[PDB]
Design a protein around this ligand. Structure first.
Ligand SMILES: Nc1ncnc2c1ncn2[C@@H]1O[C@H](COP(=O)(O)OP(=O)(O)OP(=O)(O)O)[C@@H](O)[C@H]1O
Ligand SMILES: Nc1ncnc2c1ncn2[C@@H]1O[C@H](COP(=O)(O)OP(=O)(O)O)[C@@H](O)[C@H]1O
Ligand SMILES: Nc1ncnc2c1ncn2[C@@H]1O[C@H](COP(=O)(O)OP(=O)(O)O)[C@@H](O)[C@H]1O
Ligand SMILES: [Mg+2]
Ligand SMILES: [Mg+2]
Lengths: 471, 506, 163, 353, 102
């Protein structure tokens, strides 16, 4: 066979320059195999070509043990991954291999990880709402069906708990299959997510599964973290185009994809950008976000989670992803310390489905009234810290008490956070959340206390908590 | 010390013979490809900013002409180009199609149609990097640009030939003001007056694929996409296509201003165009500057904004409007890319995120947004009511801190707080609900005279629809005379005061 | 034709570029004696060294000085094309690097190299390196070898680490 | 004539290769024939060696191929001076941009010239009479210095420049030179039409102020050289004719930003706040030429703009060291009943002793 | 280096490895480059403020800043029964302590 054998000439970290022959050099984004000492292999993706029958490749694993002059065979195509129904229930890697010790993935076809996105004529617009179960998600920024969702937040605010609680009440009752592709996560978060799906019916080892697991945390090198997003999105794109199913891609976290490319951009011969980033930050983020959309063959509801750097939304990795997402669930670190579970911002979160023509005229007035009362309480709180409560009149005194009860009513106890809260998990519907918020803003629950709505469900749980606390 | 071009492979060719290929002018060999940059060796006859073509079908633009090599920026993926591929030259510069046949179809950054409606009947070919107008072929801004908003047509009124910036934060009223102004031109484009029509030119740069499809579907349902150019430039393409989206859209919109018509370009956004120009310059081995930008950062945005001016009567009488949206970080208007676009434009519309959550739709700060043209590019009927409303809105903003203590208000303090609250609530309009010049002149006269002080604050929304519907059936002669003549005489002031006083008693 | 000798890639590719055209019709033997005359008449001469190492002159002045000195020396074949390429590209300051890399190609494909101990080895032109190093080490250790160390330094370092 | 060949073309920076002995020096204008344009000016920056020198083009370099003919003018960027430039819109290369014919000048002075010596300077600071009651009593303008005109939009910046040029030409007999470097496209056309209706620029009569076009739509070489073209025409009236000319640079902040753009694209490292390394050398070479000599003086009334309301920046502190007077136009008056809005406490000067 | 210190399963031997990485801050600035990178990889952090350490409260462990990602599963059943509301009593006592100075 005509195998393009290459010789290793340079090896500095994740980048490895391979020298081949004249004319038989591989193209960009091509997987290069390398025989090591174990039974596995060393996958290397070709990034650029330096010239003189040599191209710089990025290794997807450990580069320790490579000597100058080793054999580097080319696969001829890109990084192939297993697609179809065989990838559901198994833990796949960045190269398409199983890491669950359950044998090999019996797949009939293998698609590449590098593919072009959809065109402008193949795009299908929609305006359907998706019920999640939270009271602050079904009233403020509603999630769109088949669109991109971004859960922005800092470290320790509630980014990992927000994606786990939504998958246990929406992905478990959906008609399509899920695709949990974790990029840049932790070692303990990968083992806890696989054990929770087996006890709930999402991943059956002896039956049928509807959730694709893609491994790839921060324990590997920079090449495996940057290619973890393309390997996980290839299996979910085949179920919505060839099979025609509403796939659900769960990325955690989405901020690790941009940080992985900047770690190897300095050794590839590129100049640094702002805040130590790469120059192709808007080109690499737009090529992967445009492919996870909704076309005419099927829909794809992406529920990625963005990690803000030290609680800063003006960074180059957080502000560039806000223009490619319909619903943005930004989280604040100040609301998490007061007891709001979770810390959902009622003014910073915005969505495209928060109109009067999609949710109705009754739901549009409740969302505008809750945002106006919360914004007016911030201006009145600054005058109370210098002058006091004596400057407030009758209308300013009632608005301060209604704003405190509305902020605690939107915080509900999640089912996955039962070990930290202690109470049971509550799930409110979309019709019960709109009826409870409209009655509190009119003056029907003004005599109740603020502790009856904290960590409760809808309007039925707020009336039962007030009578039990007074006895 | 060391250099490129002739190295190992390219160096072992001139030793055996100083001829080999007789070309070395119109063609070239690719020596290094990567990060959307191709170092083609040769092409001595290739001019600056000229189009190229590779062996796989991807196009390129030679912008870094060295002495041994030639840096060309590929417009597609880097996987199609390899080491040793043939790169031919087109012989022309980076041009795009223009004419009246491009109205009704969504084109890309090079002029190719992507909407799937067949070919485009182009009447001419204009270059992307074109010169702006001089100081002798420009006139004063006298025509008025009807935007539809009540707070934009009275405060910062924009005119034909000026540059109005759309600054703001994330989700605060950036693209909402540009979409309502293009949809409000249906009353003039559907008629027969060619001087009153204004062809829109939305240039979506940096947006996703789902955002461009949703904006084109909303304009087609309201009969607004038949005379509006759409320049599709998503972030999934190369850096050369997104950076040249501002120059390609300005060349197609300049054909109407040079013939006798009016145009209106909306560069959405200005922040996304600056990131595409700095990405191609960092990969071409160039020195950077402030905020990881090149040396020509201020000249890249000032050259594309100066071409949209109002011509004189000897050039045709056309004009072109430039609506660039500056996406700020966290409300800081004195940044790096924010300060360069505000100093080159003749006005900027600020949009704060705090006023959008209170009830002001859209959030337009009157104390931060201003127009350099003034009242010279507005209607005479609307200028009489906007003169008294500007002094009342400025005095109520400085004394707005006394609203929390209503039990200690004086006579002059209670009159300014009641008139200032009714004027700000009357200018708040809904989405995709633009008003004409005749409907906005009757609503502004009732709040500035004192006919709306007796009504409550919560009844300001119901009074705007009740007064507009009653004026179209009872006093239809007063509304039609204010739009045709454009001014107000002595008989129009007495008839407007008698109709507003009789309707305020119920 | 590219021989497996690497020899850098940018600066070392000057002598390797002309070796492909000189390897035809037996023209590698005359290039060794002609390359040594260009460096010996510029180093120990103090005449054409200072007039060519400066950044002055021109393109036509540098080509006329190399053609006049080669007509009375020992250059008539392909030796005149080597000096014309380094004059237009401003590469006449490193003439010793181009002549030293040309002699390494004939000694690698038709002889041995490396070293062993003390001074140089033998560098035979047989075939394999295992059958040539064993037959030359026994004949060179007896004849000569003044020995003016390695085994005494390794024994003293092992005793200090265990104390 | 010395001819050259283009070897590199990377944006505004274009390298030309000359011969031996016929190489041009620094700050030398290079001619280049184009299509619709007359001649592409290219000022020489430095010499990289090997019969090659890097130059910066003052216009668009689109369409230039490798191997184009580049003729050398032999001197710097010359411009038309004298009484023929009054009333016409000149550019950075000394060409007319008003479509009113060519400027029939007797001589052409270069834009790159040395300033006055220490023995030819004024030994005493003289006051300049402007005619206003709030200028001759409070912050008096010095004869041969720099004055900063700080103010917002619609305060009275354009009306103060037109009234000061007409009062100096009638009481002292001195011309003016408006050099709008870094201005906008709409601001240049409105300033020329407003001066003709007031009597400052007469097409058929006699003019009294020079117009120097310098918008930001060109490259970095034309914006940085706009200050040297306007200062060369005003300095000729004080050395040859002997008159107190008044130079206007609107704005002063555009001259400092244009100098750092051409220096960063050549290979120089940046300084503080992204500024150029030769900030004190580029600003001092143009401010020292507008002084007082034995035959006349040259006043400067530039409009200094603070960066993001910061007076301790590198572009604000460098220009304030050479400013003798200051004309602060605050927004407190204007509509209060003061014509014009001249602050009597914020406007200070060093000649009020 | 911190991902290797994880608790193994019953089929791997049943062992575990605890990692205690100390982060040296500069003036309590936890929003640095090396400070924010180590806090988003570990399962919790122990904030040591310099304000409560000088007054005598040793060790200065902020209850409102330091948290554990394991929860009550990594603690004993005897300490969790007698101190089940220890995390809620620290947040209520902090807001009531500032009212005495008013
Ligand atoms: N005046 C208004 N009244 C009501 N809703 C508005 C108004 N202006 C904007 N909106 C809402 O804001 C949303 C976003 O508007 P727009 O497209 O103008 O900004 P954007 O482009 O989404 O901003 P970004 O690019 O920062 O995401 C729309 O869905 C619209 O419903
Ligand atoms: N609904 C909730 N109720 C109480 N605590 C919560 C809730 N959701 C998240 N948390 C807390 O937030 C913390 C998040 O930790 P971690 O996932 O490591 O950081 P991040 O959320 O930034 O990824 C957890 O320790 C958990 O105790
Ligand atoms: N002496 C004066 N008396 C009355 N009004 C004046 C006087 N000087 C200037 N103004 C007013 O100041 C305004 C200045 O407008 P403009 O030139 O557009 O702004 P700027 O002065 O900031 O350039 C003019 O409209 C003019 O009416
Ligand atoms: Mg997490
Ligand atoms: Mg927008």
């Amino acid at each position: 066979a005509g195998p393009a054998s290459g010789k290793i000439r340079a090896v500095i970290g994740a980048v490895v320059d391979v020298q081949f022959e004249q004319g038989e050099l591989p193209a960009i984004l091509n997987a290069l195999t390398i025989d090591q000492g174990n039974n596995q292999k060393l996958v290397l993706e070709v990034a650029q070509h330096l010239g003189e029958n040599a191209v710089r490749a990025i290794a997807m694993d450990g580069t320790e043990g490579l000597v100058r002059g080793q054999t580097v065979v080319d696969t001829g195509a890109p990084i192939s991954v297993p697609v179809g129904r065989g990838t559901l229930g198994r833990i796949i890697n960045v190269v398409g291999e199983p890491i669950d010790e359950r044998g090999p993935i019996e797949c009939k076809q293998r698609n590449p990880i590098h593919a072009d996105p959809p065109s402008f004529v193949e795009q299908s617009t929609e305006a359907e709402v998706l019920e999640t179960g939270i009271k602050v998600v079904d009233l403020l920024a509603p999630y769109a069906r088949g669109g991109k969702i971004g859960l922005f937040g800092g470290a320790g605010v509630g980014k990992t708990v927000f994606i786990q609680e939504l998958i246990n009440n929406i992905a478990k009752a959906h008609g399509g299959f899920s695709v949990f592709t974790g990029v840049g996560e932790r070692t303990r978060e990968g083992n806890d997510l696989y054990r929770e799906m087996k006890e709930t019916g999402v991943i059956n080892l002896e039956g049928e599964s509807k959730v694709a697991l893609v491994f790839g945390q921060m324990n590997e090198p920079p090449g495996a973290r940057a290619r973890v997003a393309l390997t996980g999105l290839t299996i979910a794109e085949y179920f919505r185009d060839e099979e025609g199913q509403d796939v659900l891609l769960f990325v955690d976290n989405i901020f690790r994809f941009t940080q992985a490319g900047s770690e190897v951009s300095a050794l590839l011969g590129r100049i640094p950008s702002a805040v130590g980033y790469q120059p192709t930050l808007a080109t690499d983020m737009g090529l992967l976000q445009e492919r996870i959309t909704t076309t005419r063959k099927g829909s794809v509801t992406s529920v990625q989670a963005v990690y803000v750097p030290a609680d800063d939304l003006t960074d180059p990795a957080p502000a560039t992803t806000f223009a490619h997402l319909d619903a943005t669930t930004v989280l604040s670190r100040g609301i998490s310390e007061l007891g709001i579970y979770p810390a959902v911002d009622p003014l910073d979160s915005k969505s495209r489905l928060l109109d009067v023509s999609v949710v109705g005229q009754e739901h549009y007035d409740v969302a505008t009234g809750v945002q106006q009362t919360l914004q007016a309480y911030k201006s009145l709180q600054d005058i109370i810290a210098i002058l006091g409560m004596d400057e407030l009149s009758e209308q300013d005194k009632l608005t301060v008490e209604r704003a405190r009860k509305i902020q605690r009513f939107l915080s509900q106890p999640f089912a996955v956070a039962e070990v930290f809260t202690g109470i049971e998990g509550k799930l409110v519907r979309l019709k019960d959340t709109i009826a409870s918020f409209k009655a509190v803003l009119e003056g029907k629950y003004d005599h109740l206390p603020e502790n009856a709505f904290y960590m409760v469900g809808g309007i039925e749980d707020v009336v039962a908590k007030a009578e039990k606390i007074a006895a | 010390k060391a250099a490129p071009t002739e190295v190992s492979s390219i160096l072992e060719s001139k030793i055996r013979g100083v001829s080999d290929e007789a070309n070395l002018d119109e063609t070239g060999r690719v020596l290094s490809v990567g990060d959307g940059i191709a170092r083609v060796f040769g092409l001595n006859n290739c001019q600056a900013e000229e189009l190229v073509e590779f062996a796989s079908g991807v196009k390129g633009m030679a912008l870094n002409l060295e002495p041994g090599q030639v840096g060309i920026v590929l417009f597609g993926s880097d996987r199609e180009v390899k080491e040793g591929e043939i790169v031919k030259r087109t012989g022309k510069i980076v041009d795009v199609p223009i004419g009246p046949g491009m109205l009704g179809r969504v084109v890309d950054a090079l002029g190719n149609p992507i909407d799937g409606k067949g070919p485009i009947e182009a009447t001419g070919y204009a270059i992307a990097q074109l010169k702006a107008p001089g100081i002798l072929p420009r006139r004063s801004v006298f025509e008025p640009m009807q935007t539809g908003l009540k707070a934009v047509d009275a405060l910062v009124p924009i005119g034909r030939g000026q540059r109005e910036l759309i600054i703001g934060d994330r989700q605060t009223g950036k693209t909402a003001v540009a979409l309502d102004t293009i949809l409000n031109q249906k009353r003039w484009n559907d008629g027969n007056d060619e001087s009153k029509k204004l062809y829109c030119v939305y240039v979506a740069v940096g947006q996703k694929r789902s955002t461009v499809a949703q904006l084109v579907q909303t304009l087609e349902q309201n009969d607004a996409m038949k005379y509006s150019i759409v320049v599709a430039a998503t972030a999934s393409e190369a850096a050369p296509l997104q950076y040249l989206a501002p120059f390609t859209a300005c060349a197609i919109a300049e054909w109407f201003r040079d013939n006798g018509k009016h145009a209106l370009i909306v560069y959405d956004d200005l922040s996304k165009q600056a990131v595409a120009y700095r990405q191609l310059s960092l990969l071409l081995r160039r020195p950077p500057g402030r905020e990881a930008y090149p040396g020509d950062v201020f000249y890249l945005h000032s050259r594309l904004l100066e071409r949209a001016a109002k011509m004189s009567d000897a050039n045709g009488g056309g004009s072109l409007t430039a609506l660039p949206v500056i996406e700020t970080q966290g409300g800081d208007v004195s940044a790096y890319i924010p300060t360069n676009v505000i100093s080159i434009t003749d006005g900027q519309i600020f949009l704060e995120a705090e006023l959008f959550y209170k009830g002001i739709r859209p959030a337009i700060n009157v104390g931060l947004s201003v127009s350099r043209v003034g009242s010279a590019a507005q209607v005479k009927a609307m200028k009489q009511v906007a003169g008294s409303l500007k002094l009342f809105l400025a005095q109520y903003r400085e004394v707005a801190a006394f609203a929390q203590f209503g039990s200690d208000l004086d006579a002059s303090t209670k009159q300014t707080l009641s008139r200032g609250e009714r004027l700000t609530q009357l200018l708040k309009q809904k989405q995709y609900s633009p008003q004409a010049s005749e409907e906005q002149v009757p609503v502004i006269y009732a709040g500035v005279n004192g006919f709306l002080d007796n009504i409550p604050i919560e009844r300001i929304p119901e009074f705007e629809e009740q007064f507009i519907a009653y004026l179209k059936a009872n006093e239809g002669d007063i509304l039609e005379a204010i739009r045709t003549k454009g001014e107000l005489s002595s008989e129009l002031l007495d008839k407007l005061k008698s109709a507003t006083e009789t309707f305020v008693a119920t | 034709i590219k021989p497996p000798v690497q020899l850098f890639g940018l600066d070392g590719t000057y002598a390797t570029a002309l070796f492909s055209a000189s390897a035809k019709d037996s023209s590698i033997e005359k290039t060794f004696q002609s390359v040594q005359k260009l460096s010996s008449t510029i180093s120990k001469d103090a005449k054409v060294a200072q007039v060519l190492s400066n950044p002055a002159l021109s393109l036509n002045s540098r080509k006329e000085v190399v053609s006049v000195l080669s007509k009375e020396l020992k250059l008539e074949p392909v030796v005149s094309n080597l000096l014309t390429v380094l004059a237009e590209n401003n590469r006449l300051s490193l003439f010793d690097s181009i002549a030293k890399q040309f002699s390494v190609l004939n000694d690698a494909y038709n002889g041995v190299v490396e070293a062993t101990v003390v001074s140089a080895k033998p560098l035979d032109s047989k075939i394999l390196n295992r059958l040539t190093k064993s037959i030359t080490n026994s004949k060179y250790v007896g004849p000569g070898k003044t020995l003016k160390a390695s085994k005494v330094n390794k024994l003293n370092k092992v005793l200090s680490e265990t104390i």
